[PDB]
Design a protein around this ligand. Structure first.
Ligand SMILES: CC(=O)N[C@@H]1[C@@H](O)[C@H](O[C@@H]2O[C@H](CO)[C@@H](O[C@@H]3O[C@H](CO)[C@@H](O)[C@H](O)[C@H]3NC(C)=O)[C@H](O)[C@H]2NC(C)=O)[C@@H](CO)O[C@H]1O
Length: 89
């Protein structure tokens, strides 16, 4: 959907990346160099995620588990274990 400064100020559903062009997505055009909001480089140094720290993104191929930690794989990305940016699903 539309998002960010070029798409009426919306943040993407499921805390996905918003590209500098105002569209939501999950891939390098959305999340890498041409990312505006919730970009892969925005993950915290301590890797925390979730509402308590303002719902930061996670890096490339990492998900936000329901425990509040970014990381890769089934513990972090498989449904039930993942709260947002869920991968192995
Ligand atoms: C007007 C235009 O095409 N300008 C270019 C940008 O729009 C383009 O970004 C991509 O734009 C398309 C729309 O043209 C986006 O596709 C839409 O994406 C949403 C999900 O986010 C989906 O629901 C729509 O159905 C889909 N529409 C179409 C027509 O497929 C796409 O997500 C945008 N990609 C990015 C990375 O933002 C950029 C980059 O290609 O270039 C402009 O010139």
């Amino acid at each position: 959907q539309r998002c960010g400064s070029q798409g009426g100020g919306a943040t993407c559903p499921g805390l996905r990346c918003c590209s500098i062009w105002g569209w939501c997505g999950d891939s390098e055009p959305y999340c890498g160099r041409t990312c505006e909001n919730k970009c892969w480089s925005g993950e915290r140094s301590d890797h925390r995620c979730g509402a308590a720290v303002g719902n930061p993104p996670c890096g490339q191929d990492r998900c936000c588990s329901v425990h509040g930690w970014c990381g890769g794989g089934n513990d972090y990305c498989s449904g039930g274990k993942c709260q947002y940016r869920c991968s192995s699903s």
